[PDB]
Design a protein around this ligand. Sequence first.
Ligand SMILES: CC[C@@H]1C(=O)N(C)c2cnc(Nc3ccc(C(=O)NC4CCN(C)CC4)cc3OC)nc2N1C1CCCC1
Length: 126
Amino acid sequence: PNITSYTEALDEFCIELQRIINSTKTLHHYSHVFWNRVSERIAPNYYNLVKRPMWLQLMINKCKKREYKSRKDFQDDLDLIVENCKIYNGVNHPLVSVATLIHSNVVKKIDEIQGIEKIEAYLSLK
Ligand SMILES: CC[C@@H]1C(=O)N(C)c2cnc(Nc3ccc(C(=O)NC4CCN(C)CC4)cc3OC)nc2N1C1CCCC1
């Protein structure tokens, strides 16, 4: 991959982020809980507490629209998954350790993206 422009860098970034999010499906037997939007039928009150909900399919959709312009934009959304999980369920709820495992696994995989330094360099040439 010859990344030589901002646009080429952003296209590659968002394909790589998609792959990393998709890899979380095999991470843990409760990973799937974070994939789709929380339904009111199952979580009464959820949207009374949680004003910025986040789930992994939504992050995939944002990658496909090239809405992540940096690592920080991406990690801001990933932070919400953990924050909402902790606050709604309680920090000792079993789902919390799953959300933090997803978070740390994802963050580590971003650093392993082949050519991540080159991608982030061209992303800084907005
Ligand atoms: C929203 C809080 C927390 C969370 O943080 N997320 C992200 C979440 C994402 N998805 C789910 N999904 C489901 C949740 C409940 C059920 C279900 O069928 N519950 C029964 C309903 C009838 N009742 C008599 C007995 C229990 C099915 C789900 O299908 C995938 N739950 C989540 N929960 C918790 C995990 C169980 C409760 C809520």
